[PDB]
Amino acid sequence: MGRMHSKGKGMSSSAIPYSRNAPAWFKGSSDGVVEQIIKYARKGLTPSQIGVLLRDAHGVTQAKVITGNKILRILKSNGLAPEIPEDLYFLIKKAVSVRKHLERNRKDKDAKFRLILIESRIHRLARYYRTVSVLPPNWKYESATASALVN
Amino acid sequence: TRTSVLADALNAINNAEKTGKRQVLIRPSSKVIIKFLQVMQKHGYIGEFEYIDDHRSGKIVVQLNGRLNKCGVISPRFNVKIADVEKWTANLLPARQFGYVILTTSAGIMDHEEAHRKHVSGKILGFVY
Amino acid sequence: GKGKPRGLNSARKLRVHRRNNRWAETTYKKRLLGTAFKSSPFGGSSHAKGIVLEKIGIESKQPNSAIRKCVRVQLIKNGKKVTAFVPNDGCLNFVDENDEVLLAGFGRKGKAKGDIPGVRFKVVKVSGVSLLALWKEKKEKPRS
Amino acid sequence: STELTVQSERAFQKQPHIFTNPKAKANRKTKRWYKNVGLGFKTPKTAIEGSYIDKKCPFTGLVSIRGKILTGTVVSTRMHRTIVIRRDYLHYVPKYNRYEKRHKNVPAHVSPAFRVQVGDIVTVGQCRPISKTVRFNVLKVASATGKANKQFAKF
RNA sequence: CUCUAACUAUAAAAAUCUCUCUUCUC
RNA sequence: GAAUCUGGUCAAACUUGGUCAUUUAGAGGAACUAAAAGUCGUAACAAGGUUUCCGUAGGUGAACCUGCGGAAGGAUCAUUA
RNA sequence: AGGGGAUCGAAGAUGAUCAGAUACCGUCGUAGUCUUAACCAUAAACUAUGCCGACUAGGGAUCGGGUGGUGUUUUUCUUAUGACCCACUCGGCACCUUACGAGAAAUCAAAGUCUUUGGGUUCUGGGGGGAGUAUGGUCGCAAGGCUGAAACUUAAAGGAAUUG
RNA sequence: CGGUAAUUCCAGCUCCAGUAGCGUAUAUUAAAGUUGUUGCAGUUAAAAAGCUCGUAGUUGAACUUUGGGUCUGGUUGUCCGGUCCGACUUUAUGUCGCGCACUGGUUUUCAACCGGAUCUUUCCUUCUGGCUAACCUGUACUCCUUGUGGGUGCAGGCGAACCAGGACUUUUACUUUGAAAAAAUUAGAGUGUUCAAAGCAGGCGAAAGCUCGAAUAUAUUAGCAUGGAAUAAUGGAAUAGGACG
RNA sequence: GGAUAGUGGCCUACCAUGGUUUCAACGGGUAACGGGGAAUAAGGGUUCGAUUCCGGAGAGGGAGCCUGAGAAACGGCUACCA
Ligand SMILES: [Mg+2]
Ligand SMILES: [Mg+2]
Ligand SMILES: [Mg+2]
Ligand SMILES: [Mg+2]
Ligand SMILES: [Mg+2]
Ligand SMILES: [Mg+2]
Ligand SMILES: [Mg+2]
Ligand SMILES: [Mg+2]
Ligand SMILES: [Mg+2]
Ligand SMILES: [Mg+2]
Ligand SMILES: [Mg+2]
Ligand SMILES: [Mg+2]
Ligand SMILES: [Mg+2]
Ligand SMILES: [Mg+2]
Ligand SMILES: [Mg+2]
Ligand SMILES: [Mg+2]
Ligand SMILES: [Mg+2]
Ligand SMILES: [Mg+2]
Ligand SMILES: [Mg+2]
Ligand SMILES: [Mg+2]
Ligand SMILES: [Mg+2]
Ligand SMILES: [Mg+2]
Ligand SMILES: [Mg+2]
Ligand SMILES: [Mg+2]
Ligand SMILES: [Mg+2]
Ligand SMILES: [Mg+2]
Ligand SMILES: [Mg+2]
Ligand SMILES: [Mg+2]
Ligand SMILES: [Mg+2]
Ligand SMILES: [Mg+2]
Ligand SMILES: [Mg+2]
Ligand SMILES: [Mg+2]
Ligand SMILES: [Mg+2]
Ligand SMILES: [Mg+2]
Ligand SMILES: [Mg+2]
Ligand SMILES: [Mg+2]
Ligand SMILES: [Mg+2]
């Protein structure tokens, strides 16, 4: 209901169950979960994609429930963590897409406004990550190194 | 965004009390509400109340007996001296024959009279009577 | 609610914001700006000695008609010129123009009392002696 | 610091009134005098084994520490041999029963024995005056890094 | 205890106004 | 060991300029207040006799009026008769 | 500034009305109205209700999504869709009834949870005029916008409702 | 108010208020919840930026030892112990009274009402020596009715009952206590300056010199020392470069 | 290094480029000496503090200095200005 950039007050989300431990009917092994997680990561799918695919295809509810640890942490321990966190990278991708659209057709002004919103969000998130020190303290997002990080 | 969960708890309490209800659902349910309600209950404004686990922040549901009249929270938890206690008692409580200013002490959560007999004083939380 | 800050560490604004809103009270603005020292020929003085020039009659407003016997005077302390009122019945002909007269306030904190437009001040002492002393036949004008 | 050959400028920096005899048949390094400043503060090893001079070093020089002891954070390093420490604190305005953030900037003098980076928190000590604004010497860099301890991440 | 059908069609011009305002107590 | 005298040094002052600040006339011009029995009209309050009001632009002795967008504080809370 | 140039119409031209009417009605008609890049940044830019939170009362519909029907017609024999009916739920513009809350009231389901005075927060006002005027800045080519008084002058101006 | 019946001017007579004081004027304070931190309003009465983003500022979710058991120090009210107070009066005992006017145990419960030490997979900086303060010592052995009631007594070894040196000290904000915050002023004790404003005096002998004093609190900010551990922030071990041996 | 009674850009020479600031620096006003305090009073505050006490500054304005432990003295000097 916050929705920083739009007065929308929705609460669309998920309520994960109360049982911290695994469901009683699950037959897969926590380790085998770990190896399939790592191989899908080798395929390149982001941990959100990893979670959704493991929920759709297999009895994987929450990898934290099963393996006792969370997907990004599994990747970090296994040394498959991306240099840029996925949500941030998606923000750069969206921002550069909007930038390309805007430069393509000038007069669109709501495009410019949404670009300002996206840059506000991306600066905010980068500030957070720098405080937690995931990013280098000199990591900066403006236009051109932005395009390089798009690659 | 929600800022002081204790204020929301007491606001729900006052709203549901004024309407004449008997039970209240406190949503965020942090330590301070629990201590507040034990102080309340041992004084008697509240009956046998209840905590609920939620794997996240829990919940409270509290029984009333209509004994209460009004509660409230002094959200900016002001630094009170051992002297300035009388100032708050005069400015908040109806009459010193009863009423209780609730403040956090080096001992812990505590009403004003307990604070004066223990000869300790800290930050003020709320006022009930 | 009550759209002023309430956190412990907000003190600054609660001061400076008040330090702004105080500029609304005219009393406070006059006191800090010292407008009583540039305008208002009494430089903060409750009394001043001036020299009378001419005796004038001033009309009154709508509900009240009468010729108020006012009097022009130039103040020694600054040289400015003001108009004053003679506060008893038979006292205009006590002024004896080109006379030292002591002017006081006029009962409304630098405003115009009642139905006498364009004046701000009483008259208390004429030729040293107080005017009410003359009007009570207790003392007499020196005529010097 | 004095940064690479303290014997740099037009004069000699000898530690005052100390003599190492060339005649000595040992060719020892030098008579590098020092003292324990007191107040339960340990002199750093680089203070003893160091090669700087720093007459204003509280550990090897002539200055002495007494009086006030402050705990601030380094905010400016750009000036030579000396540091600028920010002190943030609270001031109780009583008319509103409220608190007011305030900050002062105290200069101080860092011995070459100490490495300081911007953001460090420093225990500094009052001293006999050094300059127009300096009245303090740094005595203990508490957080040499603090959060800059780790620099990489390779599980 | 079963329902949702009618309907009309006018305008031109007209400005100003001298006083005198006065109590409720058994 | 004096007068005197070399150098600087602190340097108050002096002259001519510059600068800014304040008091200060200040030909004339534009106002504004109070002054209610001047004059020209009668815009507004009612559907004020062209519904008002806002922003913007134009012209006119004056209020004003007109255009373009607005708003109801409109004179309609309403046509699924 | 360049391009277009229908309509409609500030300015002007007109023919009426009137005492005057260079106003309202009536006809023509320039700039604009539409565009293309750049300035302008003001509107009664009004819901005259700042934003984020939690709670509090009854009723319906309506929009978007998602829920369950032994549901209906659908129609493609039958299932599938779609469209509907029901009971929902989450979010949105809103609405009706009421006060047991407020307000000074008009009224408000928030303008409630405020003397039984404390959820977090910005920005505004201190009688009316003078006056958004004087002056200095500052943006703009210009129009002007933001910032912004004082001297001085008054006992009112103003709000809502009541009866005439 | 006053324009021909003036309770408002101007006088006379009465009467009101304060009183050796009272009247003005300019300021300022309470009134003023009209500067609002406690404590203001923002639909139309003045006022919510046209809308959004955004640095500083401000504020910001919940959770990491709560319960229990004992002993025990006291402070309150219990039953009241001794002392004895009153109806009871010139004066004493008994009787009967507030159910004790002052000294007393408080395991008769009791109840608090703060504590302190303790055991709970529950540390209180913990060592390094002291000093052992202290007995788990147990040694020569009991001095004592036989009974550890109590003793002359020194090698391991009881450390908070205390010292005093290094090792480390996460940091605070906060809060309690103390030290400090000149006097004068304020407060406030005592005190017949004849009372009082005041003053810091005075009082008492039988006048033969013998004494009571000159009480105390506050200052809120910064600094210092100290007990506390809820609130509020900060901190660790994640590349293990982590702790103990 | 000089000079100080002594630390000190206090000053000089040679270096470096730093110092403070929207937590309000710098600048402007103060009919402002600061303070102990006074008026005011439910509580919270508002205003005043030239002056009986404590510090600071000055002896027409500025500068300079001898004596002396102590003065940049002023009922002590030197010079300029009024
Ligand atoms: Mg006429
Ligand atoms: Mg010479
Ligand atoms: Mg009209
Ligand atoms: Mg009209
Ligand atoms: Mg008409
Ligand atoms: Mg007409
Ligand atoms: Mg109307
Ligand atoms: Mg015509
Ligand atoms: Mg025309
Ligand atoms: Mg026309
Ligand atoms: Mg046409
Ligand atoms: Mg505007
Ligand atoms: Mg005004
Ligand atoms: Mg105006
Ligand atoms: Mg201007
Ligand atoms: Mg009205
Ligand atoms: Mg009469
Ligand atoms: Mg009379
Ligand atoms: Mg009051
Ligand atoms: Mg008001
Ligand atoms: Mg209006
Ligand atoms: Mg209005
Ligand atoms: Mg508005
Ligand atoms: Mg708005
Ligand atoms: Mg910020
Ligand atoms: Mg919290
Ligand atoms: Mg004192
Ligand atoms: Mg006294
Ligand atoms: Mg002062
Ligand atoms: Mg003073
Ligand atoms: Mg003095
Ligand atoms: Mg002097
Ligand atoms: Mg003189
Ligand atoms: Mg001598
Ligand atoms: Mg002198
Ligand atoms: Mg002298
Ligand atoms: Mg002399």
mmCIF file of N, CA and C (backbone and C1' of nucleotides) in Angstrom, chain C residues 1-7 13 21 24-26 29-30 35 39-40 61 108 112 117 120, chain G residues 50-52 114 117-127 149-155:
data_model
loop_
_atom_site.group_PDB
_atom_site.id
_atom_site.type_symbol
_atom_site.label_atom_id
_atom_site.label_comp_id
_atom_site.label_asym_id
_atom_site.label_seq_id
_atom_site.Cartn_x
_atom_site.Cartn_y
_atom_site.Cartn_z
ATOM 1 N N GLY C 1 -0.872 13.819 12.586
ATOM 2 C CA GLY C 1 -1.772 14.871 13.021
ATOM 3 C C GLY C 1 -1.034 16.005 13.699
ATOM 4 N N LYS C 2 -1.672 17.175 13.760
ATOM 5 C CA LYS C 2 -1.089 18.359 14.384
ATOM 6 C C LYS C 2 0.264 18.678 13.745
ATOM 7 N N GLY C 3 0.189 19.138 12.503
ATOM 8 C CA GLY C 3 1.331 19.066 11.619
ATOM 9 C C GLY C 3 2.507 19.928 12.021
ATOM 10 N N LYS C 4 3.011 19.683 13.225
ATOM 11 C CA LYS C 4 4.304 20.137 13.690
ATOM 12 C C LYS C 4 5.091 18.935 14.191
ATOM 13 N N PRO C 5 6.412 18.956 14.074
ATOM 14 C CA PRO C 5 7.200 17.779 14.435
ATOM 15 C C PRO C 5 7.078 17.485 15.915
ATOM 16 N N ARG C 6 7.235 16.212 16.258
ATOM 17 C CA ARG C 6 7.159 15.818 17.655
ATOM 18 C C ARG C 6 8.314 14.947 18.110
ATOM 19 N N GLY C 7 9.293 14.664 17.262
ATOM 20 C CA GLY C 7 10.416 13.860 17.686
ATOM 21 C C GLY C 7 11.332 14.608 18.634
ATOM 22 N N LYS C 13 13.813 22.935 14.408
ATOM 23 C CA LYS C 13 12.785 23.587 13.623
ATOM 24 C C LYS C 13 11.755 24.223 14.540
ATOM 25 N N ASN C 21 7.247 32.596 12.777
ATOM 26 C CA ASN C 21 5.871 33.019 12.988
ATOM 27 C C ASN C 21 5.758 34.186 13.951
ATOM 28 N N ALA C 24 4.603 37.655 12.874
ATOM 29 C CA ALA C 24 3.233 38.028 12.568
ATOM 30 C C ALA C 24 2.677 39.034 13.563
ATOM 31 N N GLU C 25 3.017 38.892 14.843
ATOM 32 C CA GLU C 25 2.531 39.812 15.863
ATOM 33 C C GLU C 25 3.103 41.203 15.636
ATOM 34 N N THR C 26 2.228 42.192 15.468
ATOM 35 C CA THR C 26 2.695 43.545 15.194
ATOM 36 C C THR C 26 3.501 44.107 16.352
ATOM 37 N N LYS C 29 6.972 42.702 15.960
ATOM 38 C CA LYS C 29 7.655 43.289 14.816
ATOM 39 C C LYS C 29 8.111 44.704 15.123
ATOM 40 N N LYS C 30 7.253 45.491 15.772
ATOM 41 C CA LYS C 30 7.643 46.840 16.152
ATOM 42 C C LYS C 30 8.805 46.813 17.131
ATOM 43 N N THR C 35 10.562 50.283 15.017
ATOM 44 C CA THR C 35 9.812 51.272 14.261
ATOM 45 C C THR C 35 9.366 52.430 15.133
ATOM 46 N N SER C 39 9.929 56.148 12.861
ATOM 47 C CA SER C 39 8.648 56.823 12.741
ATOM 48 C C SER C 39 8.152 57.174 14.144
ATOM 49 N N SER C 40 6.892 57.607 14.268
ATOM 50 C CA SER C 40 6.280 57.861 15.569
ATOM 51 C C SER C 40 7.087 58.895 16.341
ATOM 52 N N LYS C 61 -16.200 62.902 12.908
ATOM 53 C CA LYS C 61 -16.679 61.891 11.979
ATOM 54 C C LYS C 61 -18.202 61.914 11.906
ATOM 55 N N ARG C 108 -4.378 55.478 23.144
ATOM 56 C CA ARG C 108 -4.665 54.341 22.279
ATOM 57 C C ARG C 108 -3.401 53.748 21.667
ATOM 58 N N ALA C 112 -5.475 57.043 16.955
ATOM 59 C CA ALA C 112 -6.392 58.164 17.096
ATOM 60 C C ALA C 112 -7.571 57.739 17.962
ATOM 61 N N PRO C 117 -9.947 62.878 13.817
ATOM 62 C CA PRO C 117 -9.083 62.287 12.797
ATOM 63 C C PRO C 117 -7.726 62.959 12.751
ATOM 64 N N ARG C 120 -2.659 62.320 17.202
ATOM 65 C CA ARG C 120 -2.145 61.237 18.017
ATOM 66 C C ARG C 120 -1.828 61.609 19.455
ATOM 67 P P G G 50 -5.903 18.724 3.420
ATOM 68 O "O5'" G G 50 -5.183 17.887 2.277
ATOM 69 C "C5'" G G 50 -4.579 18.546 1.177
ATOM 70 C "C4'" G G 50 -3.163 18.087 0.965
ATOM 71 C "C3'" G G 50 -2.880 16.626 1.246
ATOM 72 O "O3'" G G 50 -3.309 15.768 0.208
ATOM 73 C "C1'" G G 50 -1.182 17.949 2.196
ATOM 74 P P C G 51 -3.742 14.261 0.545
ATOM 75 O "O5'" C G 51 -2.361 13.532 0.842
ATOM 76 C "C5'" C G 51 -1.346 13.492 -0.147
ATOM 77 C "C4'" C G 51 -0.068 12.904 0.388
ATOM 78 C "C3'" C G 51 -0.202 11.584 1.118
ATOM 79 O "O3'" C G 51 -0.314 10.483 0.238
ATOM 80 C "C1'" C G 51 1.172 13.030 2.365
ATOM 81 P P C G 52 -1.165 9.196 0.672
ATOM 82 O "O5'" C G 52 -0.239 8.481 1.744
ATOM 83 C "C5'" C G 52 1.069 8.061 1.398
ATOM 84 C "C4'" C G 52 1.766 7.442 2.578
ATOM 85 C "C3'" C G 52 0.935 6.459 3.381
ATOM 86 O "O3'" C G 52 0.917 5.172 2.799
ATOM 87 C "C1'" C G 52 2.009 7.964 4.845
ATOM 88 P P C G 114 -8.889 10.852 20.996
ATOM 89 O "O5'" C G 114 -9.671 12.228 20.833
ATOM 90 C "C5'" C G 114 -9.103 13.301 20.093
ATOM 91 C "C4'" C G 114 -8.926 14.530 20.946
ATOM 92 C "C3'" C G 114 -10.217 15.260 21.306
ATOM 93 O "O3'" C G 114 -10.145 15.759 22.637
ATOM 94 C "C1'" C G 114 -8.759 16.733 20.169
ATOM 95 P P U G 117 -6.340 13.287 27.140
ATOM 96 O "O5'" U G 117 -6.456 14.594 26.249
ATOM 97 C "C5'" U G 117 -7.050 14.533 24.963
ATOM 98 C "C4'" U G 117 -6.644 15.700 24.105
ATOM 99 C "C3'" U G 117 -5.178 15.724 23.692
ATOM 100 O "O3'" U G 117 -5.057 16.150 22.342
ATOM 101 C "C1'" U G 117 -5.722 17.716 24.866
ATOM 102 P P G G 118 -4.195 15.255 21.333
ATOM 103 O "O5'" G G 118 -3.044 14.678 22.259
ATOM 104 C "C5'" G G 118 -2.703 13.301 22.221
ATOM 105 C "C4'" G G 118 -1.489 13.059 21.362
ATOM 106 C "C3'" G G 118 -0.798 11.721 21.579
ATOM 107 O "O3'" G G 118 -0.210 11.302 20.354
ATOM 108 C "C1'" G G 118 0.709 13.455 22.046
ATOM 109 P P G G 119 -1.076 11.295 19.007
ATOM 110 O "O5'" G G 119 -0.260 10.343 18.032
ATOM 111 C "C5'" G G 119 0.397 9.196 18.535
ATOM 112 C "C4'" G G 119 1.245 8.551 17.477
ATOM 113 C "C3'" G G 119 2.114 9.483 16.660
ATOM 114 O "O3'" G G 119 3.310 9.840 17.317
ATOM 115 C "C1'" G G 119 1.008 7.984 15.225
ATOM 116 P P G G 120 4.060 11.187 16.904
ATOM 117 O "O5'" G G 120 4.586 10.894 15.442
ATOM 118 C "C5'" G G 120 5.617 9.955 15.224
ATOM 119 C "C4'" G G 120 6.154 10.097 13.833
ATOM 120 C "C3'" G G 120 6.278 11.521 13.340
ATOM 121 O "O3'" G G 120 7.437 12.167 13.824
ATOM 122 C "C1'" G G 120 5.249 10.211 11.683
ATOM 123 P P U G 121 7.672 13.717 13.508
ATOM 124 O "O5'" U G 121 8.326 13.706 12.064
ATOM 125 C "C5'" U G 121 8.445 14.905 11.328
ATOM 126 C "C4'" U G 121 7.855 14.759 9.955
ATOM 127 C "C3'" U G 121 7.372 16.040 9.313
ATOM 128 O "O3'" U G 121 8.419 16.737 8.684
ATOM 129 C "C1'" U G 121 5.752 14.341 9.043
ATOM 130 P P U G 122 9.223 17.856 9.488
ATOM 131 O "O5'" U G 122 9.601 18.904 8.363
ATOM 132 C "C5'" U G 122 8.645 19.845 7.926
ATOM 133 C "C4'" U G 122 8.208 19.605 6.512
ATOM 134 C "C3'" U G 122 7.515 20.791 5.882
ATOM 135 O "O3'" U G 122 8.446 21.700 5.345
ATOM 136 C "C1'" U G 122 6.231 18.850 5.519
ATOM 137 P P C G 123 8.702 23.098 6.076
ATOM 138 O "O5'" C G 123 7.800 24.096 5.241
ATOM 139 C "C5'" C G 123 7.474 23.797 3.895
ATOM 140 C "C4'" C G 123 6.165 24.422 3.509
ATOM 141 C "C3'" C G 123 5.787 25.650 4.306
ATOM 142 O "O3'" C G 123 6.424 26.808 3.806
ATOM 143 C "C1'" C G 123 3.927 24.199 4.124
ATOM 144 P P U G 124 6.204 28.220 4.520
ATOM 145 O "O5'" U G 124 4.843 28.739 3.898
ATOM 146 C "C5'" U G 124 4.120 29.766 4.542
ATOM 147 C "C4'" U G 124 2.638 29.555 4.422
ATOM 148 C "C3'" U G 124 1.804 30.383 5.373
ATOM 149 O "O3'" U G 124 1.586 31.677 4.858
ATOM 150 C "C1'" U G 124 1.039 28.136 5.362
ATOM 151 P P G G 125 2.127 32.956 5.648
ATOM 152 O "O5'" G G 125 0.875 33.378 6.524
ATOM 153 C "C5'" G G 125 -0.411 33.460 5.934
ATOM 154 C "C4'" G G 125 -1.467 33.683 6.980
ATOM 155 C "C3'" G G 125 -0.994 34.459 8.190
ATOM 156 O "O3'" G G 125 -1.126 35.846 7.964
ATOM 157 C "C1'" G G 125 -2.152 32.505 8.878
ATOM 158 P P G G 126 -0.222 36.898 8.755
ATOM 159 O "O5'" G G 126 -0.983 37.053 10.142
ATOM 160 C "C5'" G G 126 -2.359 37.402 10.161
ATOM 161 C "C4'" G G 126 -2.922 37.424 11.556
ATOM 162 C "C3'" G G 126 -2.097 38.205 12.577
ATOM 163 O "O3'" G G 126 -2.972 38.926 13.433
ATOM 164 C "C1'" G G 126 -2.460 36.018 13.356
ATOM 165 P P G G 127 -3.356 40.433 13.057
ATOM 166 O "O5'" G G 127 -4.906 40.529 13.388
ATOM 167 C "C5'" G G 127 -5.797 39.493 13.009
ATOM 168 C "C4'" G G 127 -7.068 40.054 12.432
ATOM 169 C "C3'" G G 127 -6.920 40.745 11.091
ATOM 170 O "O3'" G G 127 -6.956 39.837 10.010
ATOM 171 C "C1'" G G 127 -8.113 42.143 12.551
ATOM 172 P P A G 149 5.803 40.195 3.766
ATOM 173 O "O5'" A G 149 5.281 41.636 3.359
ATOM 174 C "C5'" A G 149 5.032 42.618 4.347
ATOM 175 C "C4'" A G 149 6.265 43.424 4.653
ATOM 176 C "C3'" A G 149 6.020 44.724 5.392
ATOM 177 O "O3'" A G 149 5.834 44.541 6.780
ATOM 178 C "C1'" A G 149 7.456 45.129 3.580
ATOM 179 P P A G 150 4.581 45.221 7.512
ATOM 180 O "O5'" A G 150 5.069 46.705 7.777
ATOM 181 C "C5'" A G 150 6.351 46.947 8.324
ATOM 182 C "C4'" A G 150 6.842 48.317 7.957
ATOM 183 C "C3'" A G 150 5.874 49.448 8.233
ATOM 184 O "O3'" A G 150 5.896 49.865 9.583
ATOM 185 C "C1'" A G 150 6.719 49.665 6.049
ATOM 186 P P A G 151 4.582 50.493 10.254
ATOM 187 O "O5'" A G 151 4.609 52.011 9.781
ATOM 188 C "C5'" A G 151 5.749 52.821 10.016
ATOM 189 C "C4'" A G 151 5.741 54.041 9.136
ATOM 190 C "C3'" A G 151 4.512 54.921 9.253
ATOM 191 O "O3'" A G 151 4.598 55.829 10.333
ATOM 192 C "C1'" A G 151 4.954 54.497 6.979
ATOM 193 P P C G 152 3.490 55.819 11.492
ATOM 194 O "O5'" C G 152 2.116 55.993 10.719
ATOM 195 C "C5'" C G 152 1.831 57.193 10.026
ATOM 196 C "C4'" C G 152 0.743 56.992 9.010
ATOM 197 C "C3'" C G 152 -0.616 56.610 9.563
ATOM 198 O "O3'" C G 152 -1.340 57.731 10.037
ATOM 199 C "C1'" C G 152 -0.089 55.235 7.713
ATOM 200 P P U G 153 -2.872 57.590 10.502
ATOM 201 O "O5'" U G 153 -3.656 57.247 9.164
ATOM 202 C "C5'" U G 153 -4.949 57.753 8.914
ATOM 203 C "C4'" U G 153 -5.942 56.634 8.803
ATOM 204 C "C3'" U G 153 -6.509 56.135 10.112
ATOM 205 O "O3'" U G 153 -7.553 56.963 10.582
ATOM 206 C "C1'" U G 153 -5.900 54.300 8.747
ATOM 207 P P U G 154 -8.075 56.838 12.091
ATOM 208 O "O5'" U G 154 -9.029 55.571 12.054
ATOM 209 C "C5'" U G 154 -10.194 55.581 11.250
ATOM 210 C "C4'" U G 154 -10.766 54.198 11.097
ATOM 211 C "C3'" U G 154 -11.118 53.498 12.390
ATOM 212 O "O3'" U G 154 -12.382 53.909 12.870
ATOM 213 C "C1'" U G 154 -9.935 52.019 10.970
ATOM 214 P P A G 155 -12.833 53.572 14.368
ATOM 215 O "O5'" A G 155 -13.454 52.117 14.243
ATOM 216 C "C5'" A G 155 -14.686 51.900 13.568
ATOM 217 C "C4'" A G 155 -15.263 50.563 13.936
ATOM 218 C "C3'" A G 155 -15.821 50.483 15.347
ATOM 219 O "O3'" A G 155 -16.822 49.467 15.402
ATOM 220 C "C1'" A G 155 -13.933 49.083 15.175
#
